Amino acid sequence: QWGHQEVPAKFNFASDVLDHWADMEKAGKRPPSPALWWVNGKGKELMWNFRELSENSQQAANVLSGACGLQRGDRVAVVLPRVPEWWLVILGCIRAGLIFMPGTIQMKSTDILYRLQMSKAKAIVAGDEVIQEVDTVASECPSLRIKLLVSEKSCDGWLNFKKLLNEASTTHHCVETGSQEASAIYFTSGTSGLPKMAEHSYSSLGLKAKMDAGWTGLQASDIMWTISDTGWILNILCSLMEPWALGACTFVHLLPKFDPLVILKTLSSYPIKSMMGAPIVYRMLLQQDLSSYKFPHLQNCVTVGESLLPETLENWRAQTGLDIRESYGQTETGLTCMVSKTMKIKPGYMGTAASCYDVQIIDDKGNVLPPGTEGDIGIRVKPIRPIGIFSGYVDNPDKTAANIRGDFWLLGDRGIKDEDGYFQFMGRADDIINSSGYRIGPSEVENALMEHPAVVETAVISSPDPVRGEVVKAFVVLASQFLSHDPEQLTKELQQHVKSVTAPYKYPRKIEFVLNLPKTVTGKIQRAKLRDKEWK
């Protein structure tokens, strides 16, 4: 339905990338080099060089294939905190030809159930903080056969990973996995609807990562700290595959409370040269006392996930002397556009295409648009599907086919490309409002509302109108002190306020006051959920 690939028949990140570095150490061609440095922020630290990482990951593969009896192709849910065993287990899965399916420890039992059922997981790997949740729902998951516990303690019904690991052989015969063979399944965030199962192959993660490696400016002798939930695709790409493609060290902090002061102390206390985090990390750091906590070793700061505001960029540069280089992507496509270390930074832009990709702005018929014209961001997938693109939605070929327009995979995001090929994000396409022939981006309206002291949080969406077709509607969470005000009067005041700072065709003709907004587990506002209910 979407091009053929040009790839080697076989590919495996463990054998083709990681084991190279272990072999160099074994052969005396490189000194023993740190690969994984883990700290808990309470005095415990652990470090593996590449040889040790290879050996201990071979033990993990033996545990999974031997003791757990998991066979090539079997699906393994992984729900762990930021502990070194996540890295070991994922590598174990890659070696043993098992499909790893990471998720967040922040899941409720209902979330865990949905994913285990939908995914037909045959195994779950978890820590002691989620086993009680798992054990309330496990009987309802008929494919689930193995429960593997990473803990200092044992629990009846759960296999003891750490004990089995120490018992296992340090030799494992890596499976000769195919480049297009399924390696992972990631659920999408659920921002627009129920989470989708996105299948990735050995090459779409590992070979793509190998091709991208170094875009951050990270080099072989350096340490990168990627700040991420272990359930996100960011973790596999930037915490695991990209440093290890280069022979560099990945730094992991348990960071049990995402505390920005702990982040700051960590930067200032360890020789971290490169860091990756969502824009909120930088925003939080800027609210800390950066006079008192210097980090002269830090060189490269990158971000992904939401728009990097120009003010954030400017403030960071002023306070630290450093740039923040933005990137863009989605579960389905991995790293799609970025500002590489040699590129000029353009505030408000997310960079240029990843090297495997032909990224364009396209019209409603799939035609490439000139620079300066807003349209849909797409990646060319015909006649050749590029390395890095996912394999499709599991059990949902129709949904896969629905996002292909002509020769392009649609990201679902609007954008504009400038004269140098840099992309500017212009919003989720489905969120743009069409009222009286005007297109209205909710972000500008939400920003105008957030200026007003009454507004704590807001979401702007379309609402159906006996006709203007649809109108702009704002859902507003009020500051406590405004709950007492007359709402009709306050509504007019907020309307007038927006009319004062934006094109007055953009103002919310409807305002509904609400006590909360629906969000994903990561805190992303579910505008679709609101739109769906608004439209019945």
Ligand X SMILES: Nc1ncnc2c1ncn2[C@@H]1O[C@H](COP(=O)(O)OP(=O)(O)OP(=O)(O)O)[C@@H](O)[C@H]1O
Candidate segments 142-150, 154-162, 309-317, 425-433, binder of Cl ion by CB under 5 A: 309-317
238 burial (CB, 10 Å; 0-12 / 13-18 / 19+) is: buried
Question: Minimal distance in Å, beta carbon 28 to Mg ion?
Answer: 47
Token pair of 82 as six digits: 């930021």
Cα torsion 530, 534, 535, 536 to 10°: value is 100
Residue 437, marked binder: yes
Closest CB to ligand X among residues 249, 362: 362
Asked if residue 329 binds Cl ion (CB under 5 A), the reply is no
Closest CB to ligand X among residues 158, 409: 409
- In this structure, are residues 101 and 76 in contact, taking their beta carbons and an 8 Å threshold? yes
Residue 509, marked binder: yes
**Residue 257 binding: pick among ligand X, Cl ion, Mg ion, none (C-beta 5-8 Å cut-off by kind):** Cl ion
Question: Minimal distance in Å, beta carbon 283 to Cl ion?
Answer: 5
Q: Give the Cα-Cα-Cα angle 94, 193, 517 (nearest 5 degrees).
A: 115
- The residue at minimum Cβ distance from Cl ion is 312
CA proximity to 446, closest of 458, 432, 463, 435:
458
**Residue 455 binding: pick among ligand X, Mg ion, Cl ion, none (C-beta 5-8 Å cut-off by kind):** Mg ion
DSSP 506: G
Adjacent-strand bridge partners of 102: 78
Q: Give the Cα-Cα-Cα angle 452, 527, 508 (nearest 5 degrees).
A: 40
Residue 194, marked binder: yes
**Residue 255 binding: pick among Cl ion, ligand X, Mg ion, none (C-beta 5-8 Å cut-off by kind):** Cl ion
Site for Cl ion in 264-303 (CB under 5 A): 279
- d(CA 476, CA 463) in angstroms, rounded, equals 15
Number of Cβ atoms within 10 Å of the Cβ of 135: 15
Residue 329, marked binder: yes
Asked if residue 259 binds Cl ion (CB under 5 A), the reply is yes
Q: Give the Cα-Cα-Cα angle 118, 204, 63 (nearest 5 degrees).
A: 65
**Three-state SS for 159?**
strand
Residues that bind ligand X (CB under 6 A): 188-192, 195-196, 304-307, 326, 328-331, 350, 411-413, 425, 428, 524
CA proximity to 26, closest of 53, 62, 57:
53
**Residue 414 binding: pick among Mg ion, Cl ion, ligand X, none (C-beta 5-8 Å cut-off by kind):** none
Question: Minimal distance in Å, beta carbon 532 to ligand X?
Answer: 13
- Say what angle helices 50-62 and 19-26 make with each other, to 10 degrees: 120
Candidate segments 71-79, 183-191, 231-239, 266-274, binder of Mg ion by CB under 5 A: 183-191
Question: Of 262, 286, 404, 528, which one interacts with Cl ion (CB under 5 A)?
Answer: 262
Question: Minimal distance in Å, beta carbon 309 to Cl ion?
Answer: 4
Asked if residue 455 binds Mg ion (CB under 5 A), the reply is yes
Residue 111, marked binder: no
Question: Of 91, 207, 255, 471, which one interacts with Cl ion (CB under 5 A)?
Answer: 255
Residue 317, marked binder: no
- d(CA 222, CA 218) in angstroms, rounded, equals 6
CA proximity to 124, closest of 150, 93, 148, 90:
148
**Residue 350 binding: pick among Cl ion, Mg ion, ligand X, none (C-beta 5-8 Å cut-off by kind):** ligand X
Give the residue numbers of the binding site for ATP.
188-196, 326-331, 413, 428, 524
